[PDB]
Amino acid sequence: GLVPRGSHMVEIIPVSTTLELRAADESHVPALHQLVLKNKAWLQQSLDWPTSQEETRKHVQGNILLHQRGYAKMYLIFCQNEMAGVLSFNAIEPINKAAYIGYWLDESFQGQGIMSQSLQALMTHYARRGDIRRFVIKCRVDNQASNAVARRNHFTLEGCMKQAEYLNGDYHDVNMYARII
Template sequence: MWRHPLEEGLWLQILERHHAGPLFALTDRNREHLRPWLPWVDNVREVRDSLAFIEEGLERFAQGVGYELGIWLEGNLIGVIGVHRIHRVNLSALIGYWLDAGHQGRGIMTRVTAAVLDDLFLARGLHRVEIRVAPENHRSRAIPERLGFRMEGILREAARHGDRWIDLMIYAILDREWKALRR
């Protein structure tokens, strides 16, 4: 992947090493916004932590088990969407995402997630895609709900946020369901 235009001024592009500076700046500006849901934010202390994240995504891309895409609006990096754990036998994968606080509420992540689902189901031939979300994260839950995912269950205390354990809701969609919705 590519530079994938979604609409005027909005595109996705695989994160590369030279994006580490802008990615760190974006993360640094959004610490308060991300911390309740993405506790890794406190481990990102300098540009080389963002670089390590990008390199790990490139490694996943090279191995065919995932990728990390930057979301650009009018030339500015405004968020990230990542694909994890592409399973070559089960043809399944997980999606995770985050967006700059100031760009929320415009449907950007819904459109971006739909584009990634097109890539996973139509281009890569996957069978099942999951999104895992904390029950209290209503903004994030709305994305799979809007895109036709089904809530399949709850992983109890599956994520650790400091000294707290967080439940995760599993949302999933199958290739035939996505293709039927796109018709």
């Protein structure tokens, strides 16, 4: 069910008249790399993004493999045809019909409700298919924006994982939210 977006035949999940998710493709690496440079300062404070463009290319290629194999998913949020952020399943547990969600949005597109609409469209898409029923978000207790997205979208705080993630020199507590659909 691919669909044309330039010479490129993409997998898309509709979101609204102006928003849609497109599966990351190699063609997205240059623009995605630039988006990452622009927001690098705060992305580095989060678990949502691991230097050069070749490094980005590597990351994208690895995720495309996982995406195609159903081990995870990597979608790019496009707003009116312009790349605005990333939304993914960091991991999928097919037997448990469970998935962990990761996400981030370029600073310029923030505050328009884009992430919630994108998130909602992603979960509805996989939940209708009956493929995923348990959606999980794990984020630093101290990442205000990531926690807000979870709280805006019917996720229940299941517990706080003590010093669960190593980032920039320290171990950080991380909240675990879930929603069953």
